[PDB]
Write a protein that binds this ligand. Structure first.
Ligand SMILES: O=P(O)(O)OC[C@H]1C[C@H](OP(=O)(O)OP(=O)(O)O)[C@H](O)[C@@H]1O
Ligand SMILES: O=P(O)(O)OC[C@H]1C[C@H](OP(=O)(O)OP(=O)(O)O)[C@H](O)[C@@H]1O
Ligand SMILES: O=P(O)(O)OC[C@H]1C[C@H](OP(=O)(O)OP(=O)(O)O)[C@H](O)[C@@H]1O
Ligand SMILES: O=P(O)(O)OC[C@H]1C[C@H](OP(=O)(O)OP(=O)(O)O)[C@H](O)[C@@H]1O
Lengths: 389, 389, 100, 389
C-alpha cells in the first residue's frame, strides 16, 4: 500500500502479494495445519521448444529465508531444457515444510522465477548472436519502473555486457551504460550536440555519437569523419520507416568511412533488435548493439508449483509426477536425467558420471552458503551457454 | 535499494529508475537548462494492427505531480487505434516544461503506460469474447510480485469482473476472487476437500468445486451431483495433456449433469485461455472463466516519447511529426483525426462534431481534477469497448 | 533546385527532386522555407532508405501542412506497381513515375 | 523516325533514344558544362538473388566510341554475382568524361545491358540444365522483331548451341537452326510433310520430324519407325492441353521405339520450357531442346548508372557508394571484392592473387583492343559457367 500500484518488500513478505485462495485455504485447513508436511517442486509447463537460463532464485531465498523450510534448487545462470533426455519435467526448486507455513508464497515464488527466466533466456539467445561483439540492455523503459532492476540483472546474467538502468547497474556492481540521446540534437543541433557529447565522455569509456537525428546516416557519417577525429563509435537508431535495408545502409556507411581513411570508426546499432536482427547486422559490420524490448518484455516461462509429496508419501495430481527427485547431469555432455531423490549419481554413457544439480540453499530457513553476486553468476552462465553452439 | 530487486516509490520519484544517459545529458546541458522549454508527446510505435485500451496514466500523474509541468493526456480506459483515420500517430500524453526539469522521467513514464496498456488491452479482447459470462484475472503469479497490483488493476479496467490478487483487489476496491486449489485435494482428498470448500464458502458468494485433481471430469461431475446439492459451479483446470478436446469434454459433462437433473450446476474453466479459447468454450457451455498468463504477460505497446516542440517552435527528428497537437474524435462514429493544437473542434461527417480527447490533467504540476477510481474507469472502458463489436 | 525552378517553362509544373542528400522530411521543410512557387516534391527514395514509404509520405505531408504549404503536391517514383501506386496514392501521393 | 515504332542507329547515336530530362538538364548546366568532369559506374539494383552473365557491352562501345570518354567494363560473357563477397554493389562499367559530353546516353547504355544480360543469364541457367544435350533459342517471335538479333546473340553467348533467327544467326556467324512446322502437316498432311522434310534436309544436318500435329505422339512415333529409316530426331511440341505428364509420354515413346529396334531415333522437345522443365525432360529421355519465351522475355536486370566522382573528388547520392573502384577476383575460387581504384591486386586466401576484372575498353573514345566475336565470347562464358556447378 504505497504511492504507485506496487507491492512493497513488506507486502510480499507478509504474503499480501498473492491470490486470496491461499490464505483462505490455509485457514480452512485449520488445526490440521500442523500435521501437513509437504514437498513441492517447481516445473516448467511453459515453452518446451527451447532451453532456459534459470534466474530469479535469489529473490526466492530472500523471501523464504526465516521460515522452517528446506529449499533445494538449480543455481541461477544454469542453462538446460525444461524436459530431460527422456521427456521428464525438470524441477528447478523444491520446498519442504508445513504446507500452511509457506503455501501463501506460491504466487510470489513463481513470479520471481517466471518473468526473470524469460528475460535471462532471451539475453542468452542475443548473446550467442552478438558473438565477440558487445550488446547492452536498454529495455527497462518498456516495463514498469518498479521492476527495472531485476530486468537488468537477468539481462546481465543472460549475457549482456552492460546495462542502462541506474538501479540495475547498481545491483550488478557495474557502471551504467548510455549514449547521448536524440533529444540533445533536437535541442542543440547535431554539431553542438556531438561536441558536447565528445567533451563530456569521460574515464575508460568510448565516445559514441548518435547520428540519425536529422541527416542521412551516410552523409552524417562523412560529416563526422571530416569534423572530428577521436570518435570511437557511430550509433544508428534509424527510424523503422527509414530502415529500408538496415544491412545495406551499414555497409554503405562503412565503405564511405573507409574511403576517407576512417575505418577506425566502429558502428553501433539499436532499436527493435533480436538474435536474428543482431546476427545479420553483425555480419553487415555492426560491432556494438543496444537491445531492449525483445529482452525486457520477453515472454515468461510458465512455471507451476505442485505438491509432489505428502508426509513422506509420494502424492500429486493428474498431469504431474509424484515423489521428490534429483536432476542429474553428465559432467561431460551435459545430458540430463530426472530421477527419484534416492539416486544421487549415475553413470552417463560418454563422458563419465552424472551428478545432482539440485542444491540445498536453505535448511530450516537458514542459508547453507553465501549467495553469488551477479557477475559471478553471469560468469557461470557464459560457461553454461558455451554448450549451446 | 530495498530487499528484492526493485525500485521503491522513493527511487522512482528521485529518478533513480531510469537510464543514466538522461541525467548525464541534463548535466551536459548545464546553464542552458533554464532556457530549454519543450513539449514532448508520447506515441505508439508498437503494434499498429490493433486498437488499444489506454491505461497507466494514474501512475504518471502520481510521478509528475509537483513539477512545474503542464500535462495533457487521453483518459485511461479509452479505446482507440494508434493511428488516426489518416495514419497519423496518435499522442496519448503531452508534457510541457523545462527539459531538464522532467527529462529523467522518460524511462518511468513509458514504463507506466507500456506494460499496463498491453494488459488492459488484452483483457478487453477477452471481455468481448466472454460476453455476458464473467472472467477473472488470475495471472499475477506469472509476473514479479512487486507489480501484482497494477496488473490486476489494468485487467479489471480492461473488463475483468474480478481479480485474484490481494493487493490488486484492494486497489480496485472489490473483494478478491478465489476457489479451492488442487493442493487441498492432494492433501485431504476430493470428498473432504469439497466438503471443506462448501462449508467455507461465505457471503454473497457462489460455491465452486475444483474437480480435475484425481478423477475424470465426467465422473467427478456425476459423483458431485449425487453427493452434494447446493453447488453453484464446477471448475475445470484440466491438465493440457488430458485436454484432448476441451470443448467436447465440457459438453459431455453438461449432458451427464442434465441427465441427472442437475443442469443448474454451471461450468467454469481456467488454464491457458485466450479470447479465442474463451469464445469457443463459452459456445461449448462454459459460463465462468479464469484467465491469467495471456493477460498478465501480454506484450507491451512500444510507446515512445519525443520532443515535438522547442521554445514555441515546432521541432522533431526524422520519423516523428513536429508540433503540439490535439486528438479529435467524432462524438458519434468515434472517427479520430490528429490535428495541430490550434484546432479544438472540427466537423465530422456523419454524426456531428469532433471534440478533443487530450485533456489537461496537470497545470504547473497541480492536478486539475480528482482522478477517477478504478471502477469508474472500467465503467468508461466498457462503454468504450461497446464501439468495437 | 534554383536552376530547376529557373528552367521550368510553359504550361508545366515545377518539380524538385529531394532525396539526393537529405532526409525527405527535412528536405521538404527546407524547400518550403526556401522557395514559394513549387508545384511538386518528387521522391525517388533509395530502397534501402524506404523502410515504410507510406509512412514517410505522411510524415512529409504533415510537416508541410504545419508550415502552411499543403499546396505542395507529392510525386513518387522508383519500383512501382498497381499495388505500390494504389497504396502510395492512399498515403498522399498525387503523381507517379512508373517504369520497369 | 522510320516505318515501325523504333529508333534507328542514327536516332540512338544522336541521343534521340533517351529521356528528355537529360538534354534539358545539360542545357540547364550551360557554360558549366566544360568544367564538369565525372565518373559514373553502372551497378545492379535488380535481382540480387542470382548471379549474372554480363552481356551487351558491345552495343555500349559502338555507341560511346568517338566521344572523349574513357570506358572500363567487365567483359561480356563473365558470370558473377551483383554483390561481392561482402555485399558491395559490383560496378560493371565505368565512364569518365564531361558529364554533358555523354550524359544523354544513360538511357541507351542501360538499355543495352539490362535486357541483354537478363537474356544471356537465363540461357546460362538453361545451359546448366541441358547438360551435354543441345538446346536452341527459338524465342524471337515473342519480342519485337527490331531486337531479334541481339536476343539470339545473348542467348547464344548464354550457352545456346544454336539459334533460329536469320539475322541473329548472321550476327553470331552460325547457320540458323529450324525444323518443319505444324503448318506443313496441316497443309500437306503428316506423310507428305515428313517425306518433304526428309527430302529437304541437307548438309551436315540431322533430320527432325514434327509429330504432334495430328496423331498421338506414341502412335505417330511407331508409324514413323515403320515408315522411314534414316530419321535422326522426333520432335514433340505437344499442346499443353495434351501434356498431362510430358515426362511419362517421352518414356512411353522411347520404350515403344526400342521395342521396334529403333532406339537410334533421338527425342527432341520444345514449347514452354525452363531450366526446370529442361532438366526433368532430359532425365526422362529428351536429348534436344527448343527454348524460347523463357529466355527471350527473361526479366531484365535493373541496372543503374550513377555519378560516383566529380572532378577527382568522391561524390554520390544516398544509397550509392562514392569513388571510382576496381572489381578484383580470385584467379582460383573466383572470390570477388570490390575495392577503391587505387588497389590493383590483393591476396586471395586459398588459391592466390586477386586481379582486376574491370578492363579499359575505350581511351579518349578510342577502342583499346579488337572486340571479340560472339563465338569467342560464349567460349569464355562456358568456362565461366563451369564455376557454377
Ligand atoms: O527496445 P528497443 O530495442 O530500443 O526498441 C523499442 C521500440 C523502438 C524502436 O522504434 P522507434 O525508434 O521508437 O520508432 P520506429 O518504430 O518508427 O522505428 C523499435 O522499432 C521498437 O519498436
Ligand atoms: O495463467 P493461466 O491461464 O492460469 O495458465 C498458466 C499456465 C498453466 C496451465 O497449465 P498447467 O495447469 O500448469 O499444466 P499443463 O500445461 O500441463 O496444462 C496453462 O496451460 C498455462 O501454461
Ligand atoms: O523503372 P523504375 O520504376 O524507375 O525503377 C527501376 C529500378 C530502380 C529503383 O531502384 P534504385 O533507385 O535504382 O535503387 P534501389 O534499388 O536501391 O532502390 C527501383 O527500386 C527499381 O529496381
Ligand atoms: O517460346 P516457346 O518455348 O516455344 O513457347 C511459347 C508458348 C507456346 C507454347 O504453347 P502453344 O504450343 O502455343 O500452346 P499451348 O499453350 O496450348 O501449349 C508454350 O506453352 C508457351 O506458352
Amino acid at each position: 500500500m504505497n504511492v504507485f500500484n506496487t507491492a512493497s518488500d513488506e507486502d510480499i513478505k507478509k504474503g499480501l502479494a498473492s491470490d486470496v485462495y491461499f490464505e483462505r485455504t490455509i485457514s480452512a485447513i485449520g488445526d490440521k495445519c500442523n500435521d501437513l508436511r509437504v514437498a513441492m517442486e517447481a516445473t516448467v509447463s511453459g515453452p518446451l521448444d527451447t532451453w532456459i537460463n534459470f534466474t530469479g532464485l535469489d529473490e526466492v531465498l530472500k523471501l523464504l529465508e526465516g521460515l522452517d523450510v528446506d529449499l533445494y534448487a538449480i543455481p541461477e545462470g544454469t542453462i538446460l531444457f525444461p524436459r530431460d533426455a527422456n521427456g521428464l519435467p525438470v524441477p528447478f526448486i523444491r520446498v519442504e515444510g508445513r504446507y500452511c507455513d509457506f503455501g501463501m508464497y506460491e504466487t510470489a515464488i513463481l513470479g520471481f522465477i517466471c518473468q526473470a527466466s524469460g528475460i535471462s533466456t532471451k539475453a542468452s539467445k542475443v548473446r550467442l548472436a552478438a558473438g565477440d561483439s558487445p550488446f547492452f540492455s536498454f529495455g527497462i523503459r518498456r516495463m514498469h519502473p518498479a521492476i527495472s532492476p531485476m530486468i537488468d540483472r537477468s539481462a546481465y546474467i543472460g549475457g549482456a555486457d552492460g546495462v542502462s538502468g541506474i538501479l540495475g547497474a547498481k545491483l550488478i556492481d557495474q557502471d551504467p551504460v548510455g549514449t547521448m540521446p536524440h533529444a540533445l540534437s533536437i535541442m542543440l543541433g547535431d554539431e553542438e550536440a556531438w561536441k558536447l557529447t565528445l567533451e563530456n565522455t569521460k574515464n575508460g569509456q568510448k565516445s559514441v555519437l548518435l547520428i540519425d537525428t536529422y541527416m542521412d546516416e551516410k552523409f552524417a557519417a562523412i560529416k563526422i569523419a571530416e569534423m572530428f577525429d577521436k570518435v570511437d563509435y557511430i550509433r544508428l537508431d534509424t527510424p523503422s520507416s527509414r530502415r529500408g535495408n538496415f544491412e545495406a545502409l551499414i555497409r554503405e556507411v562503412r565503405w564511405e568511412l573507409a574511403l576517407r581513411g576512417r575505418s577506425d570508426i566502429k558502428i553501433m546499432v539499436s532499436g527493435g533488435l533480436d538474435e536474428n536482427t543482431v546476427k545479420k547486422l553483425r555480419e553487415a559490420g555492426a560491432e556494438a548493439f543496444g537491445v531492449g524490448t525483445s529482452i525486457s518484455s520477453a515472454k515468461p516461462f510458465d512455471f507451476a508449483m505442485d505438491i509432489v509429496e505428502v508426509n513422506g508419501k509420494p502424492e500429486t495430481k493428474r498431469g504431474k509426477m509424484s515423489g521428490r527427485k534429483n536432476v542429474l547431469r553428465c559432467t561431460s555432455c551435459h545430458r540430463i536425467e530426472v530421477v527419484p531423490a534416492n539416486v544421487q549419481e549415475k553413470t552417463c554413457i560418454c563422458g563419465g558420471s552424472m551428478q545432482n544439480l539440485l542444491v540445498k540453499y536453505l535448511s530450516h530457513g537458514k542459508r547453507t552458503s553465501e549467495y553469488p553476486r551477479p557477475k559471478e553468476i553471469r560468469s557461470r552462465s557464459m560457461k553454461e551457454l558455451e554448450y549451446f553452439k
